[PDB]
Amino acid sequence: MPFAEDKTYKYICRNFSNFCNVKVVKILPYLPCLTARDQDRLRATCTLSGNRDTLWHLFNTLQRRPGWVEYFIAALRGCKLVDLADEVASVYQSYQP
Amino acid sequence: MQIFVKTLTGKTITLEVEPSDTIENVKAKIQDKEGIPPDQQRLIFAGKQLEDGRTLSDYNIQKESTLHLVLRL
């Protein structure tokens, strides 16, 4: 259901400050839709540039991969961000009739 | 079959060969025309340098194809 996903990255962007607590190094293993290349690239960025600066890239790389939103919820859940994970789950179901 | 060999002096001399001729043959025929040693000759085709062992058929060299001649200096 790819349409809604675009409307969700847009939400993560308008509201990006809400995800500030997400930690890239911890959530990456829980995002299997991210390619070998992607893991490599983001981990490297998370070195040189620190976490909170890498976030905007983590999300910008995800929204390119199919089905991410589904994966991204129970990523956020696996890191015990559950409050936020609920935030994302809700906004995602809002854009499908 | 015919081939053009163009020096850097800008003068072009044509020589008579066939596909089964080698590159050492072409250097020889250049020698019989321009009188320059085959040791001093480097032959270029489309910017590939030709090896003394091989033959024109190998390099896909064709009728009215052009070889570029550089000298030992």
Binding site: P2, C33, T35, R37, T61, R64, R65, P66 | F4, K6, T12, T14, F45, A46, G47, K48, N60, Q62, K63, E64, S65, T66, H68
Partner: protein, 188 residues
């Protein structure tokens, strides 16, 4: 003879214009061109872009009076990697390059979607066979300075000018390799 091929070359000049970027060829054509005319060609790419430079390049070609100029040009095309344009002009059969037109038109109106959903750096390696190996360096560099999007847009430009009969096919493979979300637009 020398006149017969000028016409044959002039007839198909369209395919040459929309395929070739002379800047990549001129290296192999070193014996035929004056420094004056090369810099004039080099300038037309930099200013009005590759097509315009191909268009100029052709003018100087047919203007060349020397011997072995048609052969010199085709021999360049092959070594330069423009083979399949080479294969086509030597057989005076363009049907191969023409079947490609359907997909060139397709890519053109799908270009926006490509621009966003493709990360070029992922797939360049795989579709490298479709592109002039020099084009690849420009893209990876646009990527580096201007970001994925600006680079993806360049990858489109070069794919359009690709003369390889299999590129759309080899693009789909490269696209299926890295689950891209653009894949199921593209249909062969």
């Amino acid at each position: 003879m020398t006149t017969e091929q000028r016409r044959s070359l002039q007839a198909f000049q369209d395919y040459i214009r929309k395929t070739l970027d002379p800047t990549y060829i001129l290296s192999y054509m070193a014996p035929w061109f004056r420094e004056e005319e090369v810099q004039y060609i080099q300038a037309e790419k930099n200013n009005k872009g590759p097509m315009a430079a191909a268009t100029l390049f052709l003018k100087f070609l047919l203007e060349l009076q020397e011997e072995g100029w048609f052969r010199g040009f085709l021999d360049a095309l092959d070594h330069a990697g423009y083979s399949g344009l080479y294969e086509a002009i030597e057989s005076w059969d363009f049907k191969k390059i023409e079947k490609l037109e359907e997909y060139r038109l397709l890519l053109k109106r799908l270009q926006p979607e490509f621009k966003t959903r493709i990360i070029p750096t992922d797939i360049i390696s795989d579709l490298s066979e479709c592109l002039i190996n020099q084009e690849c360096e420009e893209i990876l560099q646009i990527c580096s300075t201007k970001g994925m999007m600006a680079g993806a847009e360049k990858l489109v430009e070069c794919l359009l000018r690709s003369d390889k009969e299999n590129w759309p096919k080899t693009l789909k493979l490269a696209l299926e390799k890295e689950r891209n979300k653009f894949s199921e637009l593209w249909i062969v």
